[PDB]
């Protein structure tokens, strides 16, 4: 079957992003895109937002692979 991803957020999604995501050990736009059925763009945006808020650490920023860490 085809893959249906949410291009914009839902309340269930938002809660599972603000609470659940900053405790994944490895946080990757691809992993978050796979865990919660999100498009890679939206997931990336979310990650960026979370970085800006100061909830999630950054490992390496690249053109292809951007890696993130749960705080403590």
């Amino acid at each position: 079957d085809k893959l249906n991803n949410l291009v914009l957020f839902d309340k269930a999604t938002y809660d599972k992003l603000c609470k659940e995501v900053p405790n994944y050990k490895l946080i990757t736009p691809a992993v978050v895109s796979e865990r919660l059925k999100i498009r890679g763009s939206l997931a990336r945006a979310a990650l960026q937002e979370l970085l800006s808020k100061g909830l999630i650490k950054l490992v390496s920023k690249h053109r292809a692979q951007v890696i993130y860490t749960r705080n403590t």
Binding site: V7, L8, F9, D10, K11
Partner: protein
């Protein structure tokens, strides 16, 4: 980002279905007679945020995109970007749209039949032009 309450999941513009969840400049491209470049040009002339999704709009903006799209030369989309340049009929530099294209290629075909040209005869056969 956030959750938009006024979100159009399915769009219908010019008797053609547009996927609202898709990115704007690549969602207009879905209709016939509008490529990507042209869409981009429109959206830079419309003064609308390019990062926005197609469902992530007001109605007025959409209507003005429609307005620009219909009458391109008036909104300073200059005379080369248009689909049909010097028409054989009226000689008006006008960009053709969804159904219009179907009408006009058909018209061209008819005229080429009528003339009894070589291209026309090839097209009648079901063969290659170039």
């Amino acid at each position: 980002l956030v959750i938009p309450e006024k979100f159009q999941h399915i769009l219908r513009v010019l008797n053609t279905n547009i996927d609202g969840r898709r990115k704007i400049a690549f969602a207009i491209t879905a209709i016939k007679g509008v490529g990507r470049r042209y869409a981009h040009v429109v959206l830079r002339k419309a003064d609308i945020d390019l990062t926005k999704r197609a469902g992530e709009l007001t109605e007025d903006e959409v209507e003005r995109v429609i307005t620009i799209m219909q009458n391109p030369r008036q909104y300073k989309i200059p005379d080369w970007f248009l689909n049909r340049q010097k028409d054989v009929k009226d000689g008006k530099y006008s960009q053709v749209l969804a159904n219009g294209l179907d009408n006009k290629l058909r018209e061209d075909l008819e005229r080429l039949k009528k003339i009894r040209a070589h291209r026309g005869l090839r097209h009648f056969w079901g063969l290659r032009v170039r």
